[PDB]
Design a protein around this ligand. Structure first.
Ligand SMILES: O=C(Nc1ccc(-c2nc3ccccc3c(=O)[nH]2)cc1)c1cccs1
Ligand SMILES: [Zn+2]
Length: 208
């Protein structure tokens, strides 16, 4: 039921999605080990992900959350990197897209920093890198990330350096408490609380 619509680079929607991608790159504490060494991306394609069933599944859960939280879904646009990006766009998020060993327990993780999600494109820790060159810092191979609409509802605040949501909450927020430059990361425990809105195809660029 999924169709992918390509956006033109001339489209305001392509440009605002690209700007979010580029402007939320940061340096990582692993020196580039997991995701590669880069300061920016070469955006090759941005597609809108259109699936009626998956969308209705998302808005149904969004209304439930809203009604449990004074009519406030607390919806964000957040990045997601995964070796399962092609299954996610066809079948939706589900407990197979969960990071079992994540710091906030087994859930589905999203990041404000695109470069954080980039670290998971080839698996946890960057796995063994790109399939072709076995390089976590490959500048040749095409990578994909999702830019997703995510319902956080009442989010449990975790200050720090599938399971259930903490009682009385719909998500967890991981607040960075050491690295002054890191943006927040978020965890949901229900696949229905995220919709994979954009598929972004890109390369990491080698610094000059
Ligand atoms: O690599 C896997 N799953 C997986 C998918 C996404 C992430 C992920 N984790 C994050 C943690 C923090 C911030 C963003 C993310 C993010 O964008 N993605 C982690 C693990 C596997 C499970 C079973 C066989 S392979
Ligand atoms: Zn490669």
């Amino acid at each position: 039921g999924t169709i992918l619509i390509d956006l033109s680079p001339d489209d305001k929607e392509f440009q605002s999605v690209e700007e979010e991608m580029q402007s939320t790159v940061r340096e990582h504490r692993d020196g580039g080990h997991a995701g590669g060494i880069f300061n920016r991306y070469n955006i090759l394609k941005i597609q809108k992900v259109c699936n009626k069933k998956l969308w209705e599944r998302y808005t149904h859960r969004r209304k439930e959350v809203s009604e449990e939280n004074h009519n406030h879904a607390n919806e964000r646009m957040l990045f997601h990197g995964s070796p399962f990006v092609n299954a996610i766009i066809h079948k939706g998020f589900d407990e197979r897209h969960a990071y079992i060993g994540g710091m906030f327990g087994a859930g589905i993780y999203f990041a404000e920093n695109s470069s954080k999600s980039n670290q998971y494109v080839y698996g946890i820790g960057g796995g063994t890198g790109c399939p072709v060159h076995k390089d976590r810092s490959c500048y040749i191979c095409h990578r994909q990330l999702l830019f997703c609409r995510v319902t956080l509802g009442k989010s449990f605040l975790q200050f720090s350096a599938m399971a259930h949501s903490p009682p009385g909450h719909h998500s967890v927020t991981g607040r960075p408490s050491v690295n002054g430059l890191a943006l927040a990361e978020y965890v949901i425990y229900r696949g229905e609380q995220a919709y994979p809105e954009y598929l972004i195809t890109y390369q990491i660029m080698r610094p000059e």
